[PDB]
From a paper:
Among all bacterial pathogens, Legionella pneumophila maintains the largest known set of translocated substrates, delivering over 300 proteins to the host cell via its Type IVB, Icm/Dot translocation system. In at least nine instances, this regulation is direct—a hallmark of an emerging class of proteins called metaeffectors, or “effectors of effectors”. Through detailed structural and functional analysis, we show that metaeffector activity derives from a diverse range of mechanisms, shapes evolution, and can be used to reveal important aspects of each cognate effector's function. After release into the host cell, translocated bacterial substrates (effectors) regulate one another through several different functional interactions: indirectly, through counteracting modification of a shared host target, or directly through either steric complex formation or direct modification of one effector by another.
To define the mechanism of LegL1 inhibition of RavJ, we first solved the crystal structure of the N‐ and C‐terminal portions of RavJ spanning amino acid residues 1–228 and 251–371, respectively. Structures for amino acid residues 1–228 and 251–371 of RavJ were solved separately to a resolution of 1.3 and 1.9 Å, respectively. The C‐terminal domain of RavJ did not reveal any structural similarity to known proteins or functional domains, but we identified a short conserved motif (H316‐WNRHH‐V322) that is present in another IDTS, WipB, as well as several non‐Legionella proteins. A conserved motif (highlighted in gray) is located in the C‐terminal domain with surface exposed residues H316, R319, and H320. While expression of full‐length RavJ showed a severe growth defect in a spot dilution assay, mutation of each of the putative catalytic residues or the adjacent W172 to alanine fully relieved toxicity as did substitutions in the conserved C‐terminal motif. Septins and elongator complex proteins were identified only with full‐length RavJ and the (230–391) C‐terminal domain, suggesting that the C‐terminal domain is a substrate‐binding domain. Use of the otherwise full‐length loop mutant (H316A/R319A/H320A) as bait abrogated these interactions.
Residue numbers in the entry: 251 to 357, 362 to 371
Write the structure that this text describes.
């Protein structure tokens, strides 16, 4: 309930993100063009990096956690990746989001959970 490492925070975040993307108010269909999906995801991620006042109010709790600051910085980098044109499918975008907490070395999926993918 209080995430004790960055991966645990990301797991809470994934659950929230999935709920938000499945919100009926997006009016997203799985046969929509990919640009429409990617843009809706980008809007939600952007709102997340700006304090979550539009889409993340229900999950206001996560913004107080220690891990939020760094996680917001990583999501901000991904929004930049969207803006740079790195994603042509929403599937690839949510895979990036899925796996953002893992790293190489040492010191189901989001696709399946989201209806329009």
């Amino acid at each position: 309930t209080i995430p004790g490492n960055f991966a645990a925070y990301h797991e809470l975040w994934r659950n929230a993100f999935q709920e938000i993307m499945n919100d009926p108010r997006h009016q997203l269909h799985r046969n929509d063009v990919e640009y429409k999906k990617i843009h809706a995801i980008r809007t939600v991620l952007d709102d997340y990096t700006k304090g979550g006042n539009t889409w993340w109010a229900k999950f206001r709790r996560i913004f107080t956690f220690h891990w939020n600051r760094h996680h917001v910085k990583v999501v901000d980098d991904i929004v930049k990746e969207i803006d740079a044109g790195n994603y042509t499918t929403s599937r690839a975008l949510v895979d990036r989001l899925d796996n953002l907490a893992i790293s190489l070395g040492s010191k189901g999926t989001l696709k399946e959970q989201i209806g329009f993918i």
